[PDB]
Amino acid sequence: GSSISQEQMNEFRASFNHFDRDHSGTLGPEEFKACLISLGYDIGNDPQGEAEFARIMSIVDPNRLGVVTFQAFIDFMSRETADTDTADQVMASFKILAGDKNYITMDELRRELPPDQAEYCIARMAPYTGPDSVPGALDYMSFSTALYGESDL
User: Which sequence positions carry the modification called Phosphoserine?
Assistant: First the structure.
């Protein structure tokens, strides 16, 4: 949980691919900086953008290679996306860990999003009372078609 959606990695890969027509797999510090703008970042020829870009280049390239890889900008994106989610990635992730069962426990889903994101998930996930049921059993498969946190929406 707390990660990229299918549509998110789509535009991330596409923008790096749009700017990196050489398919080197890496671009320069200015090229990748303008590549963020394509996603909606105010980081381009602005002194504030330069000030935060200075942080970014130090993370993706502490070796001062003078280049940034697709995976390297993702390394910091993973830190900023820590406190946010989308319905796509949260439902998708449960199926990976609960593919062994037909349901999820509150304990198991807390591994995916340990902060209050888990509590916000329990507040919508359908309850489970099947043969393998435990007091914290929730049917994640069911969540896709039914939720109760927004019953009056």
Answer: 151
In the block, tokens 């946190």 appear at 149
Instruction: Say whether both 1 and 42 belong to one domain.
Output: yes
Question: For the chain, what is the total number of helices (H) and then of strands (E)?
Answer: 8, 5
* Residue 26, marked binder: yes
Residue 22, annotated as binding a ligand = yes
* Composition of the chain by helix, strand, coil, percent to 5: 50, 5, 40
Domain containing residue 36:
1-84
Boundary-marking domain end, from 32, 62, 84:
84
Give the tokens for residue 57.
Answer: 């280049």
- 27 shares its domain with 63: yes
Exposure string for 50-78, b = 16+ CB within 10 A, e = fewer: eeebeebbeebbeeeeebbbbebbbeebe
Name the nearest CA neighbour of 65 among 20, 116, 29, 105: 29
Residue type, 117: Q
End residue of a domain, out of 45, 66, 84: 84
